[PDB]
Structure formats: C-alpha cells, structure tokens
A paper describes a structure:
RET receptor tyrosine kinase plays vital developmental and neuroprotective roles in metazoans. GDNF family ligands (GFLs) when bound to cognate GFRα co-receptors recognize and activate RET stimulating its cytoplasmic kinase function. The bipartite GFL-GFR complexes are recognized by the RET receptor tyrosine kinase (RTK) forming ternary RET-GFL-GFR complexes (Cacalano et al., 1998; Durbec et al., 1996; Jing et al., 1996; Treanor et al., 1996). RET has four consecutive cadherin-like domains (CLD(1-4)) and a membrane-proximal cysteine-rich domain (CRD) in its extracellular domain (RETECD) (Anders et al., 2001).
A reconstituted complex was assembled consisting of the zRETECD (residues 1–627), a C-terminal truncated zGFRα1a (zGFRα1aD1-3) covering residues 1–353, and an N-terminal truncated zGDNF, residues 135–235 (zGDNFmat.), defined hereafter as zRGα1a from RET-GDNF-GFRα1a. An initial cryo-EM dataset collected on the reconstituted zRGα1a yielded a 3D cryo-EM map that confirmed a 2:2:2 stoichiometry, consistent with size-exclusion multi-angle laser light scattering data and similar to recently published human RET complexes (Bigalke et al., 2019; Li et al., 2019). Additional processing with symmetry expansion in RELION-3 (Kimanius et al., 2016; Scheres, 2012; Zivanov et al., 2018), improved the anisotropy and resolution of the map by addressing flexibility at the 2-fold symmetry axis, to produce a map with a nominal resolution of 3.5 Å. The final structure shows zGDNF at the core of the complex flanked by two zGFRα1aD1-3 co-receptors, both of which are further enveloped by two “G”-shaped RETECD molecules. There are two major interfaces between zRETECD and its ligand-co-receptor at opposite ends of zRETECD, each is well defined in the cryo-EM map with side-chain level information. The dominant interaction is between zCLD(1-3) and GFRα1D3 (defined hereafter as the site 1), with a key second site between zCRD and a concave surface presented by the GDNF dimer and a loop from GFRα1 (defined hereafter as site 2). Comparison of site 1 of zRET in both the crystal and cryo-EM structure reveals differences in the conformation of residues 288–298 from a CLD3 loop. In the presence of the ligand, this loop forms a central part of the interface with zGFRα1aD3 and is repositioned upward (loop-“up”) toward the calcium ions and engages L247 of helix α1 of zGFRα1aD2. Comparison of all available liganded RETECD structures at site 2 consistently show a spacing of 44.2–47.0 Å between each pair of CRD C termini (measured at residue E613/620 in zRET/hRET) within an RET dimer. Upon closer inspection using RELION particle reposition (Zivanov et al., 2018) a homotypic interaction between zRGα1a particles was observed throughout the grids resulting in linear arrays of complexes.
Residue numbers in the entry:
A (entry chain A), B (entry chain D): 22 to 617
C (entry chain B), D (entry chain E): 29 to 58, 74 to 113, 118 to 351
E (entry chain F), F (entry chain C): 138 to 235
Amino acid sequence: GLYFPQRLYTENIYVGQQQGSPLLQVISMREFPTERPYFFLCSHRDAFTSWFHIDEASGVLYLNKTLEWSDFSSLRSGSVRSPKDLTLKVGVSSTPPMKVMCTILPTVEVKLSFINDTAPSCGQVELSTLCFPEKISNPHITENREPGALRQLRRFTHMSICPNYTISYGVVAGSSVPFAVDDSTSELVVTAQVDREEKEVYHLDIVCMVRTERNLEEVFRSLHVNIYDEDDNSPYVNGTDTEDVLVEFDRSEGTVFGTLFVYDRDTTPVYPTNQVQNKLVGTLMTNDSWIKNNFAIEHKFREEKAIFGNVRGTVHEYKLKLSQNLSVTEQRSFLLGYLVNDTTFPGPEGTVLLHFNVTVLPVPIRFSNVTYSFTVSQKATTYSQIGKVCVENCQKFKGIDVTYQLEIVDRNITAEAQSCYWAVSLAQNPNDNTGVLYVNDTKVLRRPECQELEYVVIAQEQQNKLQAKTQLTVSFQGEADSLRTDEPRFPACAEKRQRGDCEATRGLGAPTGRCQWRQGRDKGISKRYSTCSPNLGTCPDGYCDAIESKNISICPQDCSSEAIIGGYERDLYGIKAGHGTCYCFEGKCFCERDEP
Amino acid sequence: GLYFPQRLYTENIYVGQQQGSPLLQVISMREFPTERPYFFLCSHRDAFTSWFHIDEASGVLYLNKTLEWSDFSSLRSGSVRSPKDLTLKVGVSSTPPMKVMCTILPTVEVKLSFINDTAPSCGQVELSTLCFPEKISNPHITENREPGALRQLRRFTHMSICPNYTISYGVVAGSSVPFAVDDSTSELVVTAQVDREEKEVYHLDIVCMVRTERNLEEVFRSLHVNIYDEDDNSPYVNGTDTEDVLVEFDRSEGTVFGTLFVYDRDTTPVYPTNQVQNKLVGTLMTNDSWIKNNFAIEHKFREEKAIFGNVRGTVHEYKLKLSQNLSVTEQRSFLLGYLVNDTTFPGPEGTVLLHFNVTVLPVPIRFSNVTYSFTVSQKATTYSQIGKVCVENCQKFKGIDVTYQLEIVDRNITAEAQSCYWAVSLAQNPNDNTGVLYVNDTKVLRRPECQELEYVVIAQEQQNKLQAKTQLTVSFQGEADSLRTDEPRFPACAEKRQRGDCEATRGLGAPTGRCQWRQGRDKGISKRYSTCSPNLGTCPDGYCDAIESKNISICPQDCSSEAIIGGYERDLYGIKAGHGTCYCFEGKCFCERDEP
Amino acid sequence: RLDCVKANELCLKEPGCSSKYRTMRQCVAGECRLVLDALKQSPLYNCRCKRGMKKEKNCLRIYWGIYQHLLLEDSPYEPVNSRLSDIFRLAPIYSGEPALAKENNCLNAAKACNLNDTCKKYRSAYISPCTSRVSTAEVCNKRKCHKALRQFFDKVPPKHSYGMLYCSCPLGDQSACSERRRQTIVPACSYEDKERPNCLTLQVSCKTNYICRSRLADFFTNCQPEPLSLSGCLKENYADCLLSYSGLIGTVMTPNYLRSPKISVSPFCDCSSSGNSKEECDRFTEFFTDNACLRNAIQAFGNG
Amino acid sequence: RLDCVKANELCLKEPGCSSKYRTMRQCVAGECRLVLDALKQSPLYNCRCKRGMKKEKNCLRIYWGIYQHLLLEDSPYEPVNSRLSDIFRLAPIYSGEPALAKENNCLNAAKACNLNDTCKKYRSAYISPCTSRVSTAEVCNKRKCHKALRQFFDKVPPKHSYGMLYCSCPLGDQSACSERRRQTIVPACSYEDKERPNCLTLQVSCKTNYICRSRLADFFTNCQPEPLSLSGCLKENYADCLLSYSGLIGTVMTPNYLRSPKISVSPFCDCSSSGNSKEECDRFTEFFTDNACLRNAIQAFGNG
Amino acid sequence: QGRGCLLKEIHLNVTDLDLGYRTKEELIFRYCSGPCHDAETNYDKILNNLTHNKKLDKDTPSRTCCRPIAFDDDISFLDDSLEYHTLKKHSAKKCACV
Amino acid sequence: QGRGCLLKEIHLNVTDLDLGYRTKEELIFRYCSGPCHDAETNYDKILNNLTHNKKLDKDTPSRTCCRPIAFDDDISFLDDSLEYHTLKKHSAKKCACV
Ligand SMILES: *[C@@H]1O[C@H](CO)[C@@H](O)[C@H](O)[C@H]1NC(C)=O
Ligand SMILES: *[C@@H]1O[C@H](CO)[C@@H](O)[C@H](O)[C@H]1NC(C)=O
Ligand SMILES: *[C@@H]1O[C@H](CO)[C@@H](O)[C@H](O)[C@H]1NC(C)=O
Ligand SMILES: [Ca+2]
Ligand SMILES: [Ca+2]
Ligand SMILES: [Ca+2]
Ligand SMILES: [Ca+2]
Ligand SMILES: [Ca+2]
Ligand SMILES: [Ca+2]
Ligand SMILES: [Ca+2]
Ligand SMILES: [Ca+2]
C-alpha cells in the first residue's frame, strides 16, 4: 500500500560493532493519517538474519550480536575475495504481520557490503567522500498528492567513527523551488503539493554544512527528482471534429481517407502492456450491417513535447479505412459517429465526439462515344505492340479487375478468307487495368483480303459481369519488300550486343521490324547502359509486362532471373546498371565493357 | 562276317511294273567255301516294305505287288516334290536269321529314287548315259586274300526300254593289269591274289560293247580301285641300333638327347583312335629305381612315301628325355635297352632291339684360380653396372639355380669407417645364372676411406648348399668435379626425348654419369628409333634385366606395359619400332616424329 | 570447466541423483527442502558452458530452467576461468599486422580479413544474404543475415574480427573511416527499421529468445563501471567486456556507432513514450551509451 | 517359323503334353510307341530356330537331344523359308557401291567397311585380339579371336561382310588382291598351327561343340552338287550356300583360300595317315575343295 | 554446353595422317571446333582483360576450350606389307565446352 | 593430371580487374598455368599434324587445355560510395589437364 520513494538503501559495515546500536531507519509515506505503520523484516530462511533486530514501530535497525572473525568466514557469497555482498528484504503493514504476510506485498532490497576491517582513522578521509556517496539514485514523487518527509542524508559510517563535531545541510542555488530541509532530523522534505503539468524536472544543488576549526567547510553536490503523472487531465480538440471522405475510384480494402486527432495532457506508458492508463477505447454506435461489415477504423498514438509548454504530452490519432473490396454499382451517403472514452479519468466528462462525412458513389463501366481505330505503319513482327484500350477513367481504378476480349464481325465465310483473322491477338495487364494489342502471325498479311479487318471488343467486369463494346478496325498498308523467302522464324535482338547488327535485325517485338538501339555513356556503373531492345518504351523500364513474359528472347533485361556476370547492379529482377555495353543470351547475361 | 565291297546299291524305279520281276542282286565274298550265305532284308518297321520280296538263297530282289497311282501318295519323304527318296537295309548270314539277327550285324543301305512316270521312249536317250551312271563309287579290295566276283554292271532301267539287242563289256587300255570280265554274267572279276606292297592304285578304262545296225558303238568310262593293307610286314632298321648320350650341363627336365628310328612297311591309321594296327608298344626291362624314376622316353610316328618305291609307308621314332630335375653331384654310366613289339603281326618275330649309351657326369661349382677385381672409371650414379660374376662354365648351366652374396672382410670398426660399405650392392639373374654388381649410394664416396673396399663373394647352390668364395676389391678414383651441392636426387633419362639434354643429364643407370644417346634414321617404322638410354647395352635389348625391374624410370623401353601412343610396333613388352624420335614418361610412352 | 548436459547424463544414471531430481522437478512445480541439499552438491548445480562448441541451446535451457525457477545479476554463460583466455586475447594487437600509423585502421582490418581464408568466407557469407532483395516490399531477409553474422562472430579468430568492428580513426564524422566503421554490420538491414520502439519493450523481446538472453547477461556483468580503479571497470579485464559486447551482435540487440562526437552506442531504440519510467530507460541507455569501462576498452585496442 | 524354347515353355503347361514328354524322356532312356504319336503333333517336333537372336544354344541343345537320340542328313538350323531371305540377300551386289571395274575388289570392300560404323567396329574387334601377343611362346589367344570373328559374321550386314571374304580379282598368285583375300581372316592365328591333323579327326572334333555341329550341317545340305541343272546345285539357290559356308568361320573348321590356280578350299587338315579310309577323306575334301555349286556361287557375287 | 561447338567430319586417306603406315584403306575422321563464349565466367573475363592489358608478361592461361569428352570405337587396318595395326582414341563421339 | 600445370597466385588491387568498382580493398587472385603435353592422345597428335600441314584452311580445334574445374569461395567488398557488391566464381581452387 504505502509506496517507497526509493528501492535502494545502502550502507557500509565493519568489524568491531556492538548489539543494540542503530544502523539505519526507513520511512514510509501514507496518503491519509488513519493508516499507522509497523515495520518488520523478512527472508527468515538464512541464519545470519538471526543477529539483526528491528523495532516493530519506530522503524530503525539494530543488532542482537557482536562481531567476531569467525563470523566472517561463515558468510559466503559467490567469490571469496573481499568485499562480500549480502541482500535482505523488508515490508511494512499497518497491523502485526505473519511470516506469510510479506511474500504477497511489494518489498525493497537492502544491499550492504561487508569488509573484515575495523573503524578507520577519520582524519585521513577526503572532502569529496565526506558527506555523500560515490554514486547516487534519483527518487521520485507523484503529482497532486499529500507531502511528507522524503530521504535521509546522514551517513552512519562517517558519523560514528569521528563524533567530535556537528553537521547540517542546506538547499543551495534555488530560484524558489518547493523543497526544504529540517534541522531536528536533517531530512529532505517537500514544501507542499505540486502539479506535474506545471514543472517536469527539478535540478538541485545541495551542500554539506560542517563546523571545522580551520574554516567553515562547504561541499556542493547535485541531483534532480522526478515527477509521476496521475490522469488528472481530460482530452480536448484543436479545430473541428469532422472530416470529409470520398469513395469514387479507390475501392480496394485497407485504403484510408480520413484524419482526426485528439490530445490528452497525460502520459501513456507503452510498457508494461497489461496496463490501462490514458489508453483510449473507441466504440461505434451504428447497427447497419453493410456499413459496419464494410468499413474499418484505425488507432495509432504517439507522444509529443513541443505543444504543451515543452512538456511531455500524449496525442491519439484516428483515421478511416475499408474492410473488404467493394462493388461498383452502389451509392450511399451518411454520417458515421465514433466515440472515445478515457476510462482512467474519474471525472464526469471523459469523452469526445467525432463525425465522418462519407460519400459512396458508383462508377460507369463504359467506353467513350469515340471508337478505337488503330493501324500499322509497316510490315511487322510477332509480339509487337500497336495500341492500348481502356474504359473511361482507366488510370484511377483500384480494386477493379477487368477482362478484355474481341470478336470478328463477319461470322462465317470461306475458310481462305477466315484465315485473315489470325494476324491479331490480345493481352491483359492487371497493373494498369487496360488491354494491349499485339500481332501473332505474319504469313497472313501477304494476302490482300487481310488488308482490312473488323473486331468487336468486349469488356467484362469480373464481379458484376457487366459488358461494353465498340467497333475496331485494323488496316495494314505495308507492302512486302522482297522478303517472301523468310518463313516464320525470327531471331532475337537481346544478343546482338552491338549497334551495327541490332539495326539490321528482324526479330521479336519489332513493329517496324527493326529493334531499337541505346548508347549509354558514363564513367562506370550507370543506369544508362548501351543495349539493344525491340521497343525502348517498356523493355528497360524496370519490371516486365504481360507480353515480356511470353518469350524469354524478348527483353530479358527487365524480366530475367538467372545469374549475371561482370560489373553490374541489380534489384530483385533485371539489371539496373551494368558496366558498359551489356548484353544477354537466352536467360544468361553478361554486362561488360568493350575496350575496342 | 562277309565284308561288302561297296556300301551303295542304287537304281531307279518307275510306275507300271509287275510282281515277280527281278530288280537287283547283291553278292557277298567269303574267305573259305564252308560258309554258305543266305540273304534277307531288315527294317521291317514301315509298311511299304511288305511289297518287296527276296529269295533266301540266290540273293536277287523281286516284288510282290504291282504299282498304282494311290501308292505314290502314301509314300512320304520330307518334301512333297519329286523325286522321292527311300532307304532300306539288308543283311546276309550263313543260317536262317531272326528279326533280331541283323540289328547286331553290319549292313548296307539301298537308296532308290521314286518317280511317278512310266517306261520312257528308248530312242531318245544319249550315248553318255547309256551304260553308266552319272556319278560312280570306287570299291575296295584287300591284299593277300582269295579272289572272287566284284561288281555288277547291268543297268536294269536301260535294259527293259530297248530289250532288242545284246550288250557286253571289256577292260580297255591295260598294260597287263590283273582284272578280267565275264560273259555269262558280265561281272567284273579279279584274276588272282595281289600284294599291296607292289602296287597301290589301279587306274582303269572300261568300255560298253553294244551291237547297233548303224555301227558298233563303243563308249569309254574310267575308274580306279583301292587296296586295303593287312599287317604282313615286320619292321627293320637302317644303320645301327645304338646312340650316344651325354649329360654334363643340361640337367633340366624335359630335355632330349637321343634319336632312334624304325620302319614298318604297313600303314598306321590315326582314326579311329580305338584301334591297334601297326601301333608300336614299347616296354622297358630295367628295375633300377633311380634311372627309371629319372629318365623318360618319347614316342612319335608319321608316315612316308618316298623310300618304299613311292609307296605309302610308316615310320616310328624314339628319342630320350629326362623326367625330373637332377642333382649336380652324381655320376653314373650304363646301357639302357628299350624293346618294341608290333602286336598286330602274327609271325614268330615282331620286335627289334635298341640301346642307349648314357653317360651321367657331375659338375664342380667353383670359381677360377683367378679373382674378380673390378673398378670404377669415374664418379657414378645409382643403379649403374660395373661387372658380372659367374662360376666356371656359367653360360652352359641349365636346371641350376644359384644365389650370390657378398660380405665385408673388416668385420667391426668405427661406425664412420663402417659407412664406406654402403656404396655397393648386388643383383641376381636366373636367365644367365650370374650376378650383377651395381652401386647403391653416392654420398659415401666423398670420404677418402671408401676409396678402397674388400668383399668376400659367396656362391650358394640351392639344392646342395655348396659354397665357394674369393676376394673382391673395388676402387673409386673419380674426384668430385664441383658437384657437392647435389643431394641424393637424380632425374630420369628416358624422358629427355632429345640429344642435347640427354648428353648433359645425370640420372639413373649412369656409370659415367651421363646417359647414352641413339639416332635411328630410316623411312618409317624401323627397329632403330632414336631414344635416350642410360646404358645402350641392355636398355633396348629385349628381355628386361634384374635391375631394370627396380625402378620404372630406368629404361621403360624394354619393361613398360601401359598404353603407347603414336606410330609403333610392339611385342608382349616394350617397343620394337616406333615412328621416329620416340620417348617415354613414368609408364606412358609416345613414339612420334619431330618435323623440326 | 565442465558442461551441463554431460552432468545431466551423469546424474541420469545414479538412482539417488535422478530420483531426487524428479522429486525436485515435482517440488518446485508447486522434505523438499532436504532435497535442495543433494542437488547443490551435484556438479550440475555449478555447471557452466561456453563458446566454441556446437551444443549450447540445451545447456542454456537446462540452466535457465534450474535457476530461473529457483538474469543479468547471476550469469551462467561464462565461468571465472575466462581471464586466462582474456589476457591471451589481449595480445592480438601485436599479432595483427606490421603496418600501422596510416590514415585509416578499419580499411587495414578489412584488407587483413580479405587475405585469410576463414574471415573472408564467413564475412561474404553474412554479407550476401543481407544484401539480397527478395521482394519489392522487403529489402533483405534479416533472419539469415543475423544468424550468419552471429556464426561469424562466434568462430573467426579475434585478431581479424574485432579489428573491423573496433578500428579507431581520427575524430569527427564523414571521414572515410567512420563510414566503414559504421557500415561494417550493414545497418540498412540488420540495424534499421521503420519505427523506433522503446528500449524496455525491446528488453523484454530479447528476454525470451534463448541466445540474446545470455549474450545480454554477459554485458552488464562484464562492463560494469567503477571509478575507483584506474581501469574504470569492476573485474579489471579490458577484453572480457570486449567479448561480451561483440557477443550481442546479430541478436535482437544489434547496436552500432551513433553519430555523436564521442564514442557512444545505443541499440535501435529510444526512451520515448516511457512515461514515469524514464529513469529505468535512462539507466539502461546510459550504462549502454556513455561509460568509462567501454570507452577505455575500445581505446586499448586502438593503441596498437 | 517359331522357335523351340517357346514351344518348350508351351508344352510345359499342358498336363498331357508335359506328362507324355516325361513318359517319353523315360522311354527313350532305355505304350511308348503310342506316346510317339502325341509328340509328333506338337509344334516341338517340327521346331526350328535361326540367326539374329541371342538365345540359340538352348534351342540347338533341345533339338539335338530330341533327334540325335531318336547330323548332315537332316538339319534343323535353317527352315525352308530362308529362300525369301536368300533372294533379297542376292541383291546386295547392286546395293554395295557405285565404283567398280578397278584392279582390285577386296580393297574396295575393305574401304566400304572402314566407312560404316558397324562393320568397322566389329572388324577391329575380331582383329586386335587375334594380333595380341600374350607370351613369348604363344602369338595370340585364339578363343577370343574365333568368338569375335563369329559374332561379326553373325550381325554385320551381308553387303559389307561377304564382299571382303568373297571378293574376286584377276587370276594367279602374288597379285596384291589375292594376298588380302587370303589375309582377311588373319590365318597366322585363326588358321595355322604347328601340325596338320587328319580331317576326319577334326570332323569328330567339330561334332561335339554345339555350334560348329550346326554350321557344318548347313554346309552339305545347301551346297550339295548336281550337274543336271545349269546352276550346278540341288536346291537352286546361290546365296544359301553363300551363307552356309560363311557360317563355319570361327568354328573349329576355319577354312581359307589355298594356293591353287583355281578356287579351291580346304580346312587346315590333310588326308595323311588315313590308311584304308582314304575314300571317306577324299569325298569329304572333294566336296569341300572342288565343286560346281560353290564355284558358281562365289563367281555370281563377282559379276557385279 | 554451347551449341556453336558442334561436331564435323571429313573423309581422308589413312596416309594423310602421316603416322607412317602404307595402306590404301580409308576412314571417317570426326572432330569438334566452334565457339564456347556463352559458357564463360568472371574468371575468363578477368583473364581476357589482363591479357589485353599485357600486365602478365608471358603467362597465358587458357579460357574455355571445346574439347571432346569421349572418343569413338577402335579401328584396325592392314598395311602394304600385310601387317595389321590398330589405332585407339582417334576420333570424337560427342564434345562439350570444358 | 599433368604436374606442370600448377596453381600460382598474384596480389592485386580490386581496381586492376577493371570491372568498374571504386574501392581500396585488395585480394589474392589464383590461377592455373603450365603444360599438359604428357596427357595427350592420338587425337591431339593428328590435330597438331593437320595444323602444321595447313590442310585445314581455317578450322582450328583445340588440344588439351589446363583449366579450373572448381572455383574458390565467394568474396564481398564495399565500394567508394559505401554500396556492397559480391563476386562469385572468381578464383581457382584446384587445377587439372582437361
Ligand atoms: C491547436 O489548438 C490548440 C488549442 O489549445 C492551440 O494551443 C494550438 O496552437 C493550435 N494549433 C495551431 C494553431 O497550429
Ligand atoms: C446500435 O444502436 C444502439 C441503439 O439502438 C446503440 O446503443 C449502439 O451503440 C448501436 N451500435 C451497436 C454496435 O450496438
Ligand atoms: C637306309 O637303309 C635302307 C635299307 O632298306 C636303304 O634302302 C636306304 O637307302 C638307307 N638310307 C640311306 C642310304 O640314306
Ligand atoms: Ca496534475
Ligand atoms: Ca496528469
Ligand atoms: Ca487522460
Ligand atoms: Ca518492361
Ligand atoms: Ca602284303
Ligand atoms: Ca601290309
Ligand atoms: Ca607291321
Ligand atoms: Ca633390358
């Protein structure tokens, strides 16, 4: 019950002492006077404890036996080398306690060092060690609570060996700080109550007042006490308690729109985690299953120090989020109210009120009034690229998966004329939510019947099965420049590793039929390394697209995975920088530098 | 009993024949007249045999049934295509025989061909096929035996088709040869007895006497009869019946000294091997266990034709041989008499007498009155060779195994001086029955105390443990020409594969300390191929030495075994010819030609 | 001294030893005092294991079960015979390299490690995984990195290892040396993270894994400061702390050299949101950040 | 046609078949006639095996046991369906090589065999062992040589094999060709020997080994001479004899081309010491030395 | 493993081999000869680079060499003097880049 | 298997490799060097002979090369910009004639 300002009561002991001699007194603090204390020891297990004796009421420490050299040997603690370390325990209740009474209550440790020597010559001591220890502990105090006596400052080692003079103390260099000093028992005492929200730390400077014949001896030591916060502050708000929310093209789960804050002047310990102090619990009061099952709230709290008069303060936060991935044909508008309660505040008011301005809207999956009419400049190659196709507002989609298809308009005709619909294909890209168009066969284009085609593109949203289509026409006007001999077999371009060849190849991904050429100049490993690519638009872009994954001989640069040789940097996939005129083969790559 | 001049009685048969018609008669020969024959068939198993009928006494062949087309089908023999082949058997005893009587006696086969045709037109035949068959057999006769009628010469196929005229025969172009012809039964007959030792073969020329209106037709055929030898000739001798034998230095087993012959005018069939004719059995009549247990006889017989009036005659042979490997301290002289008996000669005398002149002498295992005092020209190398050592008459030993040892004369002296007997060793060669002397260590010669050594050579015959020794002295007078730095490590010489290096190396088997050099010039694979050898005397010689077998880096040429590469010939071990400047490494060899 | 598991096998044979061991595992689970006496006499009660072997997890579990039921105050991990290794492992400075007095020592230690065939291997081993990108979200797999780093600082000879981590060089920041001295443990993976948690929370995190617990029990026990001695330490051994601190690397407590004028060190943590208990965090960090024994120890290796 | 061992497995299942087979193996060892009937009907009574497979020793043993107890006269080794292979194996001449009309044909056959990858292999295989010196007394190991020679003349296609052995070329001796035509089978090892034994003794020697016996039964049966036909043979097949003769090579009867103006052949033997039975030896040798069918057959391949 | 390092063949007389035999027999000789650049490592690139620098005076270590990892069957033949000779490991069966 | 092709070593700066890195770290590079003539077959002799004849115009198949069949452990290092790089299969561990 009665808390202990310190957990360390340390002193030194020596040989040649007598029973019935005071050694130390410990003090306890009570919030109200009806609790009267009664001191006592514990740790009755060991035998050396039978010598120490204590007074049930006053709280001072005595002894019941003298010291002898034989006693030094019987006390063993780890190593045999002096000094020897011992440890004891103590508790204080308001009524006569039993053996079992103190293993339940919180106690404190007493660490006393044992040396096998007698009292020293007291004129050989130094000034620095006269009135204060080597290292010191900083006690603590609690805000908004009754005051009392704090600590003892007499050292019984230096006070019992040379008792020819009297000593006192004093608080020094203080700009009216609420502390004091008694003279009857020379105890450091607190003047009156305090509020942590006003002052957080107390730098001090204490002195020893000694009476000496040569001159009055004053020695200065320093320390500072700490403050303990109790939740005596309810939260408030800056600004408003409302936020605007919009849901148009981002319907994926785990997305966030809103931002609301709150402030509590108290402090929120993170450890231990089984606490409740200044931790805000938020409750909703909406019963709609759709909204509740679909929407999510987020909680995240830190602490700040720069907006409370340079005092450590807490700041909660709250933001909106979705739960699951939503449909495209819904529309609702409402207000969400989310409450908060600081359960550790024993006051009439411990809450605030938030409000969200939610606007859920649907989206139309339709094409534009305009059509898509692509074309091909010249006689092309397999796995090329002509045009993209997307519904209106295609970039801004999120959480929307769409499949694209196409079909012929002339259903059934002679097979010879049916072949002319083998010179086109399609691809699908969930990243950009669009559709890429690439040729498939080239032996079809020779005929003049293929020169014009017509397709009906189909767009099918997965979740709702909605549909939308338009008319597509594709026209090739590139006459064959004396290249009939070549059958459907075209070499790659990633392996020319030179300008001269790469310009005169005809290979995969060649719209014009010639693969592109790059020339990166720099001193060392640069992000611009000379290569040969079919289309520079998306071959070294970084990652690969749906087309790049069809064949391994089409820009391995961004989609390759196997070991690479030479001077290079690389992320997960594909080379970011390689020292010089880099190149590749079917899966294996070698970035080097050509001295010639 | 009664032997058959021929084993083949062949004729042709046709459809449309009658029972009770003669087909053939077979004749048997008897040595004496009291044996009167009685003919009969056998092979009663099959059914077709029930038709044929025979006369118990006369010996002619008849039939009991006619021919019908159905009978042709029932007779099956392998293939169904004409002609069909059948086979019968016949025996002749002097008394009525049972079913069981002829499976025991020797019989003859009758091979008759069946064709499903009738008698042919007789004016369409050719002259060559008129009186004689296509192929013929040569009968045989026995020397010194009673004569008789030999063969029949009427062909019953031709006689029935044109029974108009009469035919006879005759022996033509004969210089008074003992044969004749009958007219009653037109049988070829022998005039009287004969001696095979006079005439071996009888070339003949026989004719057909036909009576024809156009002109008398004479057709000539040829044959020759063979003679059968009976052992009516005892052996004889040319020269003497004695031989000189000597046993001095060849005492190994299986060695031969003598040569004696004999002659029998008879012939000695080699096959079958279960016979006894003109095979000579030799018996000894000596009872001495030492001689009999130690000496061996050899038998080996061929046949000759050029010393009996161009007649095939037999010649036995006999030669002396040892049984086991004999001692060196024996001496005996005696006469061996070895008899022979031609057991197949039913005459009073069927033997001859041989005689051997054996002279067994001992051998002295001793050294010459002279000693062996070798020397070393210069400062040498390990596994060299200085001198051979052998007892008197060492080349001519055979069956004599000898071990050679050596020992120091100064038994015990200071150890430092004891070391000087580490610069010599010994080897042993059972081929030449001698002992080779080779150095072992070179770090010993650097002291002046080693300059003179003395050994007592020891020769110990294995079987008798005899001993013999002399005094050996070895002196080195080759001063060190500034080569102390080299420790006991010397490279090989078989791998220099060049003149220049090989002359300036110091390696194994170098008496002078330099390995020898060869230069074989020729166009292709020659037995003289340039190499580098330690000592040319025995490195490319042939059978590797006792020394050659110590290290593999000492002339692998003659004792290597592993695969070889390039142009080469090789016998069991070592290269006989390799195309050019051949060489070797530690076990692996490469004969090549150096264009430079 | 002897291991624990060997003593475990030993006591599992004697009828009395194992019988009372079971009686005890039952007593502590909820006469028994008389059974305490027998346990103390057994070698197990005083059993302590160490490094260099390949069976420790079981030893540590055994001792933790024995004494946790009946962490920094009383440490098992190191016997009192390590001073014999301590003094000999204070010699490496003379054994390191003849060249000295250059503009940088970290680079020289790296040169020396890329010439020996054990430090080189293990260094590249706990390097490459820490630099391995396995997804566009992650940058590396720390589990592999920490474990490899650990098994390097366990085996490779001290002469070549400590040098790279404790190399001294002229004061300041942005001196090529300090860059490498900081980048020895590749902090981007093994050090950094998105958020800084309070040290006390990380102190509890360490207190569960069976390795960090002991590598931390070693720290306080060795490097404890005392000003009375000229050395500044308690147990008068400069290399004992030198080992104890390096024994933490890889574990949940992966410190590095902060950006401070002096030689300070802190784990990836800060005394934020600690509220009333800013004293405990401050003591922890001060003992870990600004101390005499550790500065003296790290300086000793510098004067080579 | 079907093999014998397959028919053996077949008959070993039927109760009656195997029961009477055992009854019979008992009868012939010393009603039984009624058991003869059942055996004849079984496919086993007419079973015949051939070349190209790898299980023959057992077939040959089976049939020899069946019929020897109850050799040239009635041969098993070849069914009557081989003519179909015979005519097709008379074509090789056209399939051999375009070049022709040179000064030598044996050399051309050798050239053709050292360009195909089966004849080449097997030729070097039965060559090298026959030229291997294994002691100063011996010159080569004949067992290996004969067996390798055999398994070559069993597999390698006739187009390339027969040519080297039957190559024709201008008359005489000491014409480079005849040297090679003679030295094809390396006679120094597979032909020669220190003494010439009588052929009849060698005839009995062959009559025991289970292979030479059949390879000889084929000879008389195929090449039997008859003058009535223009061909000169009996069964009017030039390549049947061509196969039968080549089927002897390797076995105990290893013939080669003698030194005679015409095309004569004799095994390593002579009719010496034959005594009264010079007729049997003479017939044997004449059938083997001077015949029409064989000369015509070997000449047919010559006109290509 | 490189596919440019392939197997070719040429028809020769045995005498073109210059091994000394006198015969009119012939043969098919087989061999491997092509590039193996697609199988190189960092080792080879460093070698190439130090060769081009001339910084290694004389040492010239070998980059990847298309060599035959197995040989064809034995061959036999007769020379002009009617003596037989046999050649082993004379021809490649299947090469690689090692 | 030849004993003349042996493992030698030379101390270099990483920068002498010309791979583009900027660092002051150093290394031990190891490599194979020496003759392999004692391991040759008939194949190589024929090749040598047809090369010296010039009878193969351009084809130049390789004779035995002495090459590594196993590589040393991985190396790591830090460049001047304080970025790490790692090199694999850079140095020989054991050598052989192949
Ligand atoms: C937010 O409101 C608080 C109310 O106490 C005020 O002190 C603070 O200055 C405000 N923040 C601003 C103005 O940025
Ligand atoms: C539901 O409505 C009741 C009032 O009817 C309210 O108290 C409650 O907070 C609402 N939400 C939930 C989750 O109960
Ligand atoms: C050997 O003696 C026989 C005695 O019949 C004689 O015919 C023969 O000529 C003799 N051999 C000679 C003289 O060479
Ligand atoms: Ca307050
Ligand atoms: Ca408060
Ligand atoms: Ca609060
Ligand atoms: Ca891309
Ligand atoms: Ca007579
Ligand atoms: Ca006679
Ligand atoms: Ca006689
Ligand atoms: Ca020799």
